[PDB]
Write a protein that binds this ligand. Structure first.
Ligand SMILES: O=P(O)(O)OC[C@H]1O[C@H](O)[C@H](O)[C@@H](O)[C@@H]1O
Lengths: 636, 121, 242
């Protein structure tokens, strides 16, 4: 009889101390909320990344009796068990907020057991393992070294119930085991995507013709069968199966053959300002930095008003189709036409921030920004001169024939010498006849073959004066150390007016989510995990008021989706300053729903769905009755 | 040979066919300009902290007229900021300051550059 | 009594016969101004030294990216002038911050000053409430507090207008227009108007405090005024902002 109240929690994943993908950021940002609950009853388990862990971990001495509480001794003796059997591992705390306890297993000092385990796996579950697949190899290693540890802990401990949460198939190996070996631990499996899902979408329909795909064939078809088997196994073994979004919970049911018990959306450690309107002041400051870049980029061709200019951006890994760079650019070309037809006076500058092979900034980019800087300095000099002449007049009035309190003639303030140098500054900003502002800020390694650049050229967005939409490709991550747009990413977002992320395969929209928390409106899609999460929370029309524009990519045809994207953009362009300000306030208030202080409750429902499925009895006794166990939502 | 600690920077200002300034020349100047700007920000913060100390002495447990510990004046965010501008100034290991500020039309046959390359300055 | 960490600086802005600002008032602001200017010069010098270190690292024996010892940044001439600046701000032994910014024509007979003396708020370190009588209308052109009245109001946290006779509260209303909470009485036109316009005990949530001076004896009134102020002093910046 174990306590369903005071229990333990173990969370396992490949990214437990090495930044590989989005999962690292999820586990890290969740730390504070879960360490606040479990204190020392919580542990993270992952493979020891020998090359990096030393910068990430606070390596501690697990040997001391003072390195554990009394009721936590079991773990200390289970770690000793592994130590007798020759297993190397690192104990300590992540060097992040919340300082969660971490257990990193050196897979090297276990690799010998490979051939034995591999075979055992192939015969107990039916999971092949080609030698060359180092990933599945290290997966099996980890999987066994984990089940090993867990099994011993369940053995050494008799008070606490034990919850074992696993993230992604790379850490799902230990799940089929626990089920077989009948270990006494409740297990949860979360998948942040699906193997079949990615690969099917890696070519060119899916969200429609997928209910009827043959899972086992496509697996082999892609050469992913063994990997797929671990995902399915893990998915079936665990007490509670979950995904990160509803849209992924759909593909998981049809491609892993098991309707998930619920959703565990990704939250953020949202840092809030003492003054709610502060994010608004930040927007204004950050935008002036963008303004400064823009003047440099459009030098000699600066014919629009920045006070009447909107900044759109898309950002993420360079996945032309999957992130919808193609929709984004095609939509902007159509937006441009609409704005010119309708006689709009507004200007849209669009940024594409996706890392591509480049030889750094162009000379033109650096040159332009320098020449603007030179003009600023010359203006500053001229004005301190003007100031001294205004001051003299003022303190001298009404003597010496001064009849007016203030100068009335520009000639009194602006002298010949001042005019000469200002004019030389203006001359330096002039660009060759017929030359236009570039559509890219860097020298590309392979310009002719770049997808973004080809698309921009195809739709002919060349930053002509008559173009109401301007295009800027910045093929590199944003960094405040950069010479021309010296902003970190979060600073740049704050300064913009609208994010546009027309994704196709996106189990969770990290980007739109970040963007919302910055108090910036964004366009996402219903096939994006963030989008699907948002349209279940607010009615798709009401959503727009909150700065959430959801494009339909599941049910509309592609040209329909594009026109809808254009519609949204145009609707946003027509807003006034006051409406933009109010909208941002609204989207910023939304941000609280993206915080772990709320999202973290789902991780709670999942752990209790497993504690009620694991020991339905001690839960009928601890609650007084038995409640519905078909959902995470049914139990609450 | 004379153990002199002086340095001579020699400038050759003679027009030759070129494709304008190198990216390196422009980038370096911008990188230094950015360090300068950040330093201005930090010293503004420092001034605030020196002023506060100066105006409230000797109350609230201030035993000295001035701060004595750099840590009272220089915060960790100030340091992260400065260390980043320093990192941006770092050259690829083994790389030396160039002997020319421009991209040359016919670099390989330039009399002056070939002379510099021959005497190995 | 509650050992609060807060400090209230209280301003009385009512015109009285005066012979203008005290030399002390002008002298003190000039001396604070001189300290700021001197600090600017020092930070400029500190700047160049941080910059040199940063641009030079890691050559010429610099083992750290940044200076670690203050002595590298702050030199003797810098210290000397900063201390001269500090000395000029020192006031005579046992001298306290004045309760008035002007030279009164008739200081001994003044009702406001006599009251402050009677209650004994002389701006001592142990006093959690400070007192400043500025017996002149505010104006952006005056040498010590260069703010027009509206600017001054916006900068404050709380208007306190405990009126006995006041057909209409221009002041608390003007105060309200600028998002500054205030304290009024139910015998002022503004107070009586707001008493009716807003649900009884909601006014405080909107920053309108109404003291009952109609159906309470003066002592009860005062203690309610104090209740209000003490309640406001308890607020967080967040609460004050909302
Ligand atoms: O960039 P916009 O949408 O035009 O917003 C501009 C507004 O941004 C913030 O709200 C600032 O606090 C306002 O001063 C500014 O006018």
């Amino acid at each position: 009889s174990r306590d369903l109240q005071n229990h333990l929690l173990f969370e396992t994943a490949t990214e437990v101390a090495n930044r590989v993908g989005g999962i690292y950021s999820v586990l890290k940002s969740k730390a504070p909320i879960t360490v606040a609950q479990y204190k020392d009853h919580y542990h993270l388990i992952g493979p020891l990344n020998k090359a990096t862990y030393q910068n990430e971990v606070d390596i501690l001495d697990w040997k001391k009796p003072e390195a554990f509480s009394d009721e936590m001794r079991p773990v200390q003796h289970a770690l000793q068990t592994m130590e007798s059997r020759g297993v190397h591992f690192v104990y300590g705390r992540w060097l992040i907020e919340g300082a969660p306890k971490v257990i990193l297993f050196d897979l090297d000092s276990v690799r010998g057991y490979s051939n034995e385990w591999k075979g055992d796996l192939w015969s107990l579950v039916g999971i092949p393992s080609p030698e060359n697949d180092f990933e599945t190899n290290d997966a099996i290693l980890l999987g066994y070294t984990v089940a090993w540890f867990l099994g011993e802990v369940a053995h050494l401990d008799s008070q606490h119930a034990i919850v074992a949460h696993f993230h992604e198939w790379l850490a799902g190996v230990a799940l089929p085991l626990c089920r077989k070996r009948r270990i006494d631990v409740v297990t949860i499996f979360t998948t942040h995507a699906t193997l079949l899902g990615r690969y099917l979408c890696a070519s060119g329909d899916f969200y429609n013709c997928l209910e009827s795909v043959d899972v086992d064939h496509e697996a082999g078809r892609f050469g992913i069968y063994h990997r797929y088997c671990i995902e399915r196994a893990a998915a079936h073994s665990a007490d509670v199966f979950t995904t990160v979004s509803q849209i992924t919970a759909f593909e998981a049911e049809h491609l892993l053959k098991r309707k998930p018990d619920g959703i565990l959306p990704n939250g953020l450690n949202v840092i809030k300002f003492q003054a709610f309107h502060e994010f608004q002041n930040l927007h204004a400051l950050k935008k002036e930095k963008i303004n400064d870049f823009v003047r440099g980029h459009f030098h000699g061709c600066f014919d629009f008003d920045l006070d009447n200019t909107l900044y759109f951006f898309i950002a993420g890994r360079y996945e032309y189709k999957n992130k919808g760079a193609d929709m984004f650019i095609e939509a902007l070309a159509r937006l441009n036409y609409r704005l010119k037809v309708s006689g709009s006076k507004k200007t849209v500058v669009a940024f594409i921030v996706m890392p591509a092979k480049n030889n750094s900034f162009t000379v033109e980019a650096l040159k332009g920004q320098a020449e603007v800087r030179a003009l600023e300095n010359t203006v500053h000099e001229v004005t301190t001169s003007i100031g001294k002449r205004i001051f003299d007049h003022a303190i001298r009035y009404p003597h010496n024939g001064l009849t007016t309190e203030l100068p009335t003639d520009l000639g009194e303030l602006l002298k010949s010498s001042d005019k000469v140098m200002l004019k030389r500054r203006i001359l330096a900003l002039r660009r060759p006849e017929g030359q236009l502002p570039p559509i890219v800020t860097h020298n590309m390694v392979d310009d002719a073959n770049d997808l973004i650049l080809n698309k921009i050229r195809q739709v002919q967005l060349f930053n002509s004066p008559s173009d109401r939409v301007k295009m800027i490709f910045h093929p590199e991550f944003l960094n405040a150390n950069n010479p021309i747009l010296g902003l970190d990413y979060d600073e740049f977002v704050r300064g913009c007016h609208l994010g546009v992320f027309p994704s196709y395969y996106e189990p969770w929209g990290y980007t739109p989510a970040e963007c919302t928390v910055m108090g910036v409106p964004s366009i996402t899609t219903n096939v994006s995990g963030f989008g699907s999460y948002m349209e279940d929370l607010i009615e798709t029309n009401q959503a727009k008021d909150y700065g959430i524009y959801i494009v339909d990519r599941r049910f509309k045809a592609p040209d329909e989706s594009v026109e809808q994207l254009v519609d949204y953009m145009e609707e946003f362009v027509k807003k006034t300053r006051r409406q933009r300000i109010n909208q941002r306030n609204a989207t910023e208030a939304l941000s609280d729903l993206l915080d772990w202080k709320r999202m973290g409750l789902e991780y709670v429902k999942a752990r209790q769905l497993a504690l009620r499925r694991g020991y339905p009895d001690q839960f009928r006794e601890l609650v007084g009755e038995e409640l519905n166990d078909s959902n995470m939502d049914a139990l609450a």
